[PDB]
A paper describes a structure:
RNP rearrangements driven by the RNA helicase PRP28 lead to disruption of the U1/5′ss interaction, and stable integration of the tri-[name], converting the pre-B complex into the spliceosomal B complex.
The 5′ exon nts −4 to −1 are base paired to U5 loop I nts U43 to U40 (EV1H and EV2A–D), whereby G−1 forms a non-Watson-Crick base pair with U40, which is additionally stabilized by hydrogen bonding of K1306 of PRP8 to N7 of G−1. Our structure reveals that the 5′ terminal nts of the intron, i.e., the 5′ss dinucleotides G+1 and U+2, are recognized in hB exclusively by amino acids of PRP8 and DIM1, respectively, in an extended conformation, and thus are not contacted by RNA. The extended U6/5′ss helix runs along the PRP8 N-terminal domain and is contacted by the B-specific proteins FBP21, SNU23, and PRP38. The SNU23 zinc finger is located directly adjacent to FBP21’s zinc finger, and interacts with intron nts +9 and +10, as well as U6 nt 33 in the extended part of the U6/5′ss helical region. In our hB complex, the latter region of MFAP1 and UBL5 indeed form a continuous channel in which both proteins interact with nucleotides at the 3′ end of the 5′ exon, and we can unambiguously identify the molecular contacts involving these proteins that stabilize the 5′ exon at this stage. In hB, the region of SF3A1 comprised of aa 409–449 binds [name] SL1.
Residue numbers in the entry:
A (entry chain A): 196 to 664, 679 to 682
B (entry chain T): 880 to 1025
C (entry chain C): 109 to 951
RNA sequence: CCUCCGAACGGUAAGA
RNA sequence: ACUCUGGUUUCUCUUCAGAUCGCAUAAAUCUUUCGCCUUUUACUAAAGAUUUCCGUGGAGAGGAACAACUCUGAGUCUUAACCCAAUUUUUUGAGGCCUUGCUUUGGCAAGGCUA
């Protein structure tokens, strides 16, 4: 709307909005930003679909990170919480047998001691509570009232607020015999802010921004990488809805499990010297810099990867093998056993081949968009399909099976999004294009695989060019 | 808010009604101890207590039904006690006589709670013996089916 | 030492002058901004200590359990120097006390050594359960009450009430608190109103704190030629401001004018907050310039909440209104020492120490009262903490520590200890000092060993007349009962050591060893015992300890008159004690326990009361021998002997043994070894023969026990379980869930009322203490974390069923029906005590 | 209700 | 109401990195256990320790680029309309003399005269 969305209208869909404007960002390097309250309000309203209606953390009682750490340390799972393996294995939990202290005939049972109690108060209801985390007890109930009408005054007695009772006044001052002149203020004395109005049209929005999810309660901040915004993290951090199928519930629990594991295993980054690869590359005479269309550089990367694997194949004189442009190794003819054993590559070549296959699929979907064959909505749906169906489009799970962990995750997110997407007038069938969730997962997979693949391919290429890089008796 | 108060008030009413029912049940269990006492006779005699006004949200029909249920439960307890005491004597079997049982269970408080006279007591003992004979027939059928 | 505004030696100089000292305890409900207020005070005094832009400082939350849970657990002292409106420095001894009801005892440990109580009220919540409990406790401890309404920003930035409606909410809070105080007191000088200076309005998150005097002084500074004392006498109530006459009139000038408090105080505050949070970029610099507030460029770039805090710190400045409140309405130790000795000293004010201490002489006989015990950093030794009521305690001076059992006749419970270092606690750094004069608060090392919970430190060989201070009376009763064992029995010794240390850390903790070797801990609630066991496992013992499922401590009562005149014949077969047992009238036990009636009274007043309100025979009323099992115990031993049968001289020589035997017999109990409660024992026939050798104490006391039990057992005995009172602050749509949860736990709702000036509802209900385990967790789970509840012990209520009904079968893993409950609860209690299964009348 | 669908190798006749 | 001070962007490098480096989250290696198991990988999933990788903050240095100019800080942060003022400062009648006594004169103290 040119009227409602004026603060963000002219820069909302730019690639890097407000980059040139020194009022909002530090400069072209895009490190810091500092917005105004109307812009923050418009952005917050535009994002109210991906945010939570909760103004308080009290919703996450026995469902925050500390509760999950406690349940993991106790080999217990809260309803909807993740399951883990026990911390202490070699101490049997049924080895404790019927002594006089655990005598069943000695204890009174009226209400069963659920596992919720053993985590709310872990030192009371649990024996040997090792590595338990005390959950935050209670935050005072935020009674903020969201108003969906700007016409309402920023301050007004809401009908939701219960009315206050009748009069009472015990002020028994001395009844003055009135032949006197009483107190008078000086001539130029007035209330402190008589001039300023009680409330403007940006006051209610700022008050609403106070009780807003991060970063919409922020005024300034630092830019983050586009892959560092999960955008659905608070969707599986809430309790799963009522009538969801079993697969959706287990997807919520698995996303929650990996969130818990990431939060628990997190160690601070180590101090190190600032090594930069592309800066070193640019410092040589063998690398130049330009500004290319992303689709063009994607096609260049696909062609270069194809040529590079094909050179790796033709180096070993394997004419009976054919690397196709979708990165499929193919037998040209029926191969003899001697030809089959000479056509046996390691997991390095095949993992690079499958990663290039996935990149080719993504860049090819983008090319199909640019050629006009497929439009933007179907492009987004195709990317969402690709990043959630890597187990079928590509085959890198058979050369590095640990990445199956990623695949399951990309399926889990597919559930989490779909049952938030296909609600109401929206049914099943293709159409969801919220591909950020799986795109992040595959980027983080590549983050850890890059050193491994680089080491493997360095060994392989060094080998191509004659290079390398009862005990005691 | 109108919907909200309607929802709250109906459950408030249900809670008060069920609390009154529980209080009347507690009064029935604390004072009435004999199954031979009539329901309305005690109701016309137990109204002189202190908490007898605990049924301010109850009518004569509900109170009489609750008294009937309590009397039935007390009679069941007395019958179970009589049956349990009938499992101790060796003369009690599937073909015992009531005349001999009148001396075997002469000073039997459980049987006295079951029946004051020999007619109802004999009928109950005969019913129990018939049940025991049916159980023996079931045992014979289970043994002979294999 | 961290850098402060004032000289440390100046603080030591303030120590000598008892007039320049205020002993203030900050009390209130859970999470009503008590700790954040102390955070603001620390920030005001300590320049280098500042709140994080995102996380609360929580300076007095020094326990790791407190930091993780977020709930204050133990009271923490801060001794600071604070300037008032006039600028005169004062030495404030502040007790930051927990707001959770289960830790009410902790508040009591700070109310003993405090002269004044500042009671914090959430402006958005109002008066809550612990607020009422602490009003009652502080008034009944004879302390000066000053209310402070914290979190007034919630009326603005969160409830968004119009300023007139915010004034109405504040007025409702003040009026409700005044009604509460008037209910539990007699004086008219205990009325609270900001007109008198008894109330401060504050928001501790944004560092707002003002009385009418401080805001009037802000007006005077911005304008001049204004008597801010005379001006502040008019900024409250229906007094309006006519600008035609520049006057203040109790009538409305127009037909739609506002109050003076709204115009001059609330409205500028609303406009300040609105301009900061809504128009930070458009009209904020002009608004700040109009207020004479200059912020740098790097300070306007802050987020909205740090900016609000900074702006309100620049505008309001310092918490001078709070200091005005605590100076003008809380007596100094010298002024307030007379009622303190009148109330909490056994010898009273009429002794030679009841006046040497009432003057608060810094150079008299050393008499200090230590009522807190704070752990060392490692957790091996302890530091006592208490008020120096008289004298000047020195470092190295040996002292005589007197426990709670020290009397003048029996002086076994005393020890000569060496006072080590002395500290002044500012809650995160201890100022080590050489001496502490009277009227102050002191940490003492070395004297901890003979101190169990509360101790009186006096001069060795100085005052042979020195008695002890009265032991702490707690607001609630330790009811929840856990049993602890060591995982490795070989480590049973260590646990005992640990069980001692927690016994010193928690004033209401009741540890003991039962007959069957069980180690039983009594606490007040689930959170209380969870913190106790965290400290027992992690802090002190550092071993592995198994817990039993918590239970409650039952009591035993009667419902009918005993059918037989239960008699006991002594082994010499000459004394025949024949008694009956019947229940006391409804509420008589409440009168006995609350010290409405006392055994120290003359027979005149005691008989007058018992004839006035209970319709007895005056002969029987004059003949009330003993209250059991203690002087305050809710059991009565009425002598019903006829004048012409048992002579008074024949019976007065054996009354004492009968009384002691009755006391310990009601202390033990014959059903499941529990206290006998609410029983009247009429001694009908006391056949006592002539020989004084055949009627000795060892001849009567066990016989007194036997006759007590026989009278009890024939009077239709019943079990009584404790009932907790629960307040639930739940949203309006989550009330049905509260009803459903309370239905499963034998709990009935007394009331469910909307909270005025807030969208929430308050549900007040009664729940059995044995059924209230995990009740808070179930309530918060079933209401999506919205319904929060606090549970406190309220009363005792008969367990359903007959405990002695031996015709009841019990299946060991099934919640029994109500008529069987009393049969169940007794048996499984006896098995835990290590007693016989069935209770037999033949003993 | 149950939806986690893996892979490669250990499969070369040796000769003329 | 004034005088002296004086930037921003961007690239690269060298170091220090506690900090939610990171309001995000990968991989590998080793040591314990865990599930399979038929040989290596490839694996299952928990703990601890290491690395590696995608990133980040602080300081310093050297360049290119709106650099030529404010702002910030410090500094007392300059004056005549209408007030010559009747309790603690710089326009307030309070001003003096002698007697007496003390004191080595000097000097000190109480009293009187007071328009």
């Amino acid at each position: 709307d040119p009227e409602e969305d004026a603060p963000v209208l002219d820069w909302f869909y730019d690639h890097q909005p407000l980059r040139d404007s020194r009022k909002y960002v530090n400069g072209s390097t895009y490190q810091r930003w500092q917005f105004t309250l109307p812009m923050m309000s418009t952005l917050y309203r535009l994002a109210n679909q991906l945010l939570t209606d909760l103004v308080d953390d009290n919703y996450f009682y026995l469902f925050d990170l500390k509760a999950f750490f406690t349940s993991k340390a106790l080999n217990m799972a809260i309803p909807g919480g993740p399951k883990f393996e026990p911390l202490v294995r070699d101490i049997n939990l049924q080895d404790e047998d019927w002594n006089e202290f655990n005598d069943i005939n000695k204890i009174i049972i009226r209400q069963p001691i659920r596992t919720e109690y053993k985590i709310a108060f872990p030192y009371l209801y649990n024996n040997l509570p090792h590595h338990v985390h005390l959950t935050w007890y209670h935050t005072p109930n935020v009674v903020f009232i969201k108003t969906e009408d700007p016409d309402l005054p920023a301050f007004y007695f809401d009908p939701l607020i219960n009315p206050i009772s009748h009069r009472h006044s015990v002020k028994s001052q001395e009844p003055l015999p009135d032949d006197d002149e009483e107190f008078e203020l000086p001539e130029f004395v007035e209330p402190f802010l008589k001039d300023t109005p009680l409330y403007t049209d940006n006051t209610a929005n700022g008050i609403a921004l106070l009780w807003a999810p991060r970063p919409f309660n922020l005024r300034s901040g630092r830019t983050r990488r586009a892959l560092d915004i999960p955008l659905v993290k608070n969707w599986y951090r809430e309790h799963c809805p009522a009538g969801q199928p079993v697969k959706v519930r287990v997807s919520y629990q698995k996303l929650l499990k990996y969130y818990v594991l990431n939060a628990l295993k997190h160690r601070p980054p180590k101090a190190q010297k600032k090594r930069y690869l592309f800066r070193s590359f640019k410092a040589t005479k063998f690398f130049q810099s330009t500004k290319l269309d992303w689709v063009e550089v994607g096609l260049q990367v696909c062609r270069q990867g194809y040529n590079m694997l094909n050179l790796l194949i033709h180096r070993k004189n394997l004419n009976y093998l054919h690397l196709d442009y979708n990165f499929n190794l193919k037998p040209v003819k029926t191969l003899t056993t001697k030809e089959r054993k000479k056509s046996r590559f390691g997991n390095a070549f095949h993992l690079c081949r499958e990663v290039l296959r996935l990149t080719k699929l993504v860049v090819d979907s983008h090319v199909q968009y640019r050629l006009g064959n497929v439009d933007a909505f179907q492009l987004a749906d195709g990317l969402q399909y690709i990043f959630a169906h890597v187990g079928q489009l590509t085959g890198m799970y058979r050369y590095k099976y640990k990445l199956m962990r990623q695949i399951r995750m990309c399926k889990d997110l597919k559930h989490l999004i779909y049952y938030r997407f296909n609600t109401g007038p929206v049914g099943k069938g293709p159409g969801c294009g919220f591909w950020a969730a799986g795109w992040r997962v595959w980027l983080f997979f590549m983050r850890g695989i890059t050193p491994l693949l680089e080491r493997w391919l360095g060994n392989l290429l060094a080998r191509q060019f004659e290079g390398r890089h009862s005990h005691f008796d | 808010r109108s919907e909200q108060t309607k929802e709250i008030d109906r459950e408030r009413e249900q809670h008060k009604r069920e609390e009154a029912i529980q209080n009347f049940k507690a009064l029935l269990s604390d004072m009435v101890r004999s199954s031979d006492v009539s329901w309305s006779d005690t109701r016309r005699t137990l109204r002189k207590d202190h908490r007898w006004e605990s049924g301010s949200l109850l009518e004569r029909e509900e109170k009489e039904k609750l008294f009937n249920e309590h009397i039935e439960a007390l009679t069941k307890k007395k019958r179970e006690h009589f049956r349990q005491l009938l499992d101790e004597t060796s003369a009690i079997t599937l073909t015992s006589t009531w005349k001999e049982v009148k001396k075997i269970i002469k000073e039997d408080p459980r049987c006295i709670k079951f029946s004051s006279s020999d007619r109802k007591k004999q009928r109950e003992f005969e019913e129990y013996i018939r049940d025991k004979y049916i159980t023996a027939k079931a045992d014979f059928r289970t043994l002979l089916k294999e | 030492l961290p850098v402060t505004v004032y000289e440390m030696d100046f603080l030591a100089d303030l120590m000598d002058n008892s007039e320049l000292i205020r002993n203030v305890t900050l009390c209130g409900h859970l999470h009503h901004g008590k700790t954040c207020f102390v955070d603001c005070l620390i920030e005001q005094t300590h320049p280098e200590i500042r709140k994080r832009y995102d996380q609360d400082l929580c300076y007095t939350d020094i326990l790791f359990t407190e930091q993780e849970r977020g709930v204050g657990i133990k009271s923490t002292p801060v001794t600071v120097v604070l300037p008032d409106t006039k600028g005169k420095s004062y030495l404030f001894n502040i007790m930051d006390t927990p707001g959770h009801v289960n830790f009410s005892d902790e508040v009591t440990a700070g109310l003993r050594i405090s002269d004044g109580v500042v009671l914090f009220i959430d402006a958005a919540e109002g008066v809550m359960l612990n607020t009422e409990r602490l009003i009652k406790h502080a008034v009944q401890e004879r302390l000066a009450v000053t209310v402070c309404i914290n979190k007034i920003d919630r009326l603005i930035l969160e409830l968004k009430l119009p300023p007139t409606d915010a004034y109405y909410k504040l007025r409702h809070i003040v009026d409700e608190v005044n009604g509460l105080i008037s209910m539990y007191s007699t004086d008219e000088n205990l009325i609270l109103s900001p007109l008198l200076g008894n109330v401060c309005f504050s928001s501790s998150q944004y560092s707002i704190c003002f009385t009418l005097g401080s805001f009037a002084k802000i007006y005077a500074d911005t304008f001049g030629d204004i008597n801010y004392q005379e001006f502040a006498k008019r900024l409250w109530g229906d007094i309006y401001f006519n600008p035609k006459t520049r006057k203040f009139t109790k009538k409305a000038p127009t037909s739609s004018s506002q109050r003076s408090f709204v115009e001059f105080i609330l409205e500028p505050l609303y406009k300040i907050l609105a301009q900061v949070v809504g128009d930070v970029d458009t009209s904020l610099p002009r608004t700040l310039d109009e207020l004479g507030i200059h912020l740098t460029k790097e300070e306007l770039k802050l987020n909205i909440r740090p900016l609000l805090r900074l702006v309100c710190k620049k505008f309001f400045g310092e918490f001078t209104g709070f200091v005005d409140m605590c100076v003008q309405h809380i007596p100094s130790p010298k002024v307030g020492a007379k009622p303190k000795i009148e109330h909490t000293y056994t010898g009273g004010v009429d002794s030679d120490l009841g006046e040497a201490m009432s003057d608060c002489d810094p150079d008299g006989p050393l008499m200090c009262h230590t009522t807190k015990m704070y752990s060392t950093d490692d957790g091996v030794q302890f530091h006592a903490f208490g008020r120096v009521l008289s004298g000047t305690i020195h470092a190295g001076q040996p002292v005589k520590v007197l426990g709670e059992n020290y009397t003048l006749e029996d002086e076994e419970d005393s020890q000569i200890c060496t006072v080590g270092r002395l500290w002044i606690s500012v809650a995160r750094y201890h100022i080590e000092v050489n001496r502490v004069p009277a009227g102050n608060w002191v940490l003492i090392e070395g004297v901890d060993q003979p101190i169990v919970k509360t101790a009186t430190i006096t001069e060795p060989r100085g005052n042979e007349e020195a008695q002890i201070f009265r032991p702490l009376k707690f607001n609630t009763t330790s009811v929840i009962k856990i049993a602890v064992e060591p995982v490795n029995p070989s480590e049973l010794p260590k646990m005992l050591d640990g069980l001692r240390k927690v016994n010193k850390s928690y004033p209401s903790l009741t540890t003991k060893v039962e007959e069957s070797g069980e180690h039983v801990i009594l606490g007040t609630g689930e959170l209380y015992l969870d913190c106790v066991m965290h400290d027992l496992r992690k802090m002190y013992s550092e071993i592995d300890i198994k817990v039993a499922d918590p239970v409650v401590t039952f009591c035993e009562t009667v419902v009918e008159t005993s059918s037989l005149k239960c008699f006991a014949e002594t082994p010499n077969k000459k004394n025949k004690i024949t008694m009956i047992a019947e229940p006391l009238e409804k509420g008589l036990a409440e009168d006995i326990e609350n010290e409405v009636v006392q055994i120290t009274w003359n027979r005149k007043k005691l008989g007058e009361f018992f004839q006035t309100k209970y319709d007895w025979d005056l002969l029987a009323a004059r003949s009330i021998w003993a209250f059991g099992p203690d002087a305050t115990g809710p059991n009565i031993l009425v002598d019903d002997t006829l004048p012409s049968e048992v002579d008074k001289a024949l019976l007065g020589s054996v009354k004492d043994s009968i009384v002691q035997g009755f006391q310990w017999g009601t202390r033990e109990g014959p059903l499941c070894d529990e206290l006998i409660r609410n029983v009247k024992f009429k001694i009908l026939d006391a056949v006592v023969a002539q020989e004084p050798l055949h009627r000795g104490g060892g001849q009567i006391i066990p016989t007194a026990r036997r006759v007590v039990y026989s009278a009890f057992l024939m009077a239709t005995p019943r079990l009584m379980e404790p009932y907790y009172f629960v307040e639930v602050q739940a949203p309006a749509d989550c009330v049905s869930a509260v009803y459903t949860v309370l239905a499963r736990r034998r709990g009935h709702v007394t009331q469910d009322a909307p909270i005025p000036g807030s969208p929430l509802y308050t549900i007040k209900a009664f729940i059995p203490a044995i059924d209230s385990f995990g009740f808070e967790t179930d309530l918060r789970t079933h209401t999506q974390g919205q319904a929060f509840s606090l549970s406190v012990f309220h009363h005792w209520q008969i367990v359903p069923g007959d405990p002695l009904d031996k015709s009841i079968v019990i299946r060991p893993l099934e919640p029994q029906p109500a008529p069987h409950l009393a049969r169940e609860f007794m048996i499984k209690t006896r098995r835990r005590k290590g007693l016989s299964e069935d209770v037999s009348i033949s003993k």
